[PDB]
């Protein structure tokens, strides 16, 4: 029973928030991220100069590439829920792998089945 994790939770983790630590420990390994998330996180690693060790933490995840059929689902999902394209891609990845989506984004994702929000902040 596995989940796919949105970028914001991973950013919070590397940024030193226990809120993100607990959110990840709430689901069994191996967990997953979108290849999009991998890019979003690796950008921040460069900014903060941890790029090698960040790459090693991300490798424990299942990094799910963006396929043609994930592309087709994202297109549909984008119209249905009025999602931005990256959000649609991440949601599509979780649906087609039948994974729960874990994100702090309650504005765009509230009311969408299979999307769970573990914690909140200011």
């Amino acid at each position: 029973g596995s989940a796919l994790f949105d970028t914001n939770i991973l950013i919070d983790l590397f940024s030193g928030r226990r809120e993100a630590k607990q959110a990840l420990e709430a689901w069994p390994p191996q967990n997953a991220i979108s290849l999009i998330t991998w890019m979003e996180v690796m950008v921040g690693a460069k900014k903060y100069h941890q790029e090698q060790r960040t790459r090693m933490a991300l490798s424990t995840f299942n990094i799910i590439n963006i396929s043609q059929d994930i592309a087709e689902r994202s297109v549909a999902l984008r119209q249905e829920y009025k999602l931005k394209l990256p959000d649609a891609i991440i949601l599509a990845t979780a649906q087609l792998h039948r994974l729960e989506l874990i994100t702090r984004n309650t504005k765009d994702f509230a009311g969408i089945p299979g999307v769970v929000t573990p914690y909140e902040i200011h």
């Binding site: 590397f14 226990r18 979003e40 921040g44 984004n105």
Partner: protein
Amino acid sequence: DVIQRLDDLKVQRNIPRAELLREAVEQYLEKQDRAKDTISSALGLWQDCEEDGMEYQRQLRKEW
């Protein structure tokens, strides 16, 4: 039926089913340990990053 696969597993293995579980339970717990290890060293891995993850995200979704 997890009990059946266990004892036809046992035909092959020559081992009490309780060692089949203290196999099964063990390996699983070790798997959880590995995850705990990885996550702990990632926290926080970015030394000098004060950014809020959701704020971060909103920026790159609008890509900076």
